[PDB]
Subunit: 28 residues, 3 copies
Amino acid sequence: RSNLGWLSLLLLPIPLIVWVKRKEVQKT
Amino acid sequence: RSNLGWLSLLLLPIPLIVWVKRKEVQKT
Amino acid sequence: RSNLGWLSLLLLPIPLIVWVKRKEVQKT
C-alpha cells in the first residue's frame, strides 16, 4: 500500500549534495 | 492538479549530476 | 508527456550516487 506522498518525500534530499559542490571542492 | 505537479519538477534536476560521470573524459 | 507513475521512478535512482561518494574510490 505505497503512499503517493512518500514518493514526493524522496526527491527533496538528493538536491542537497549538488549545492555543496558549488561552494567548493577542496580549495580554490 | 497544481501542487502535485511541483513535486515532479524537483526530481529531474538532480539526475543531471549522475549523467556527467557517465560522459567521463575531460577537456574543460 | 509522461505518466504519473514515471515521475516517481526518477526520484529512486539519484540517492544511490551519494552513497558511492562516501566510499570514495581510488583514481577519479
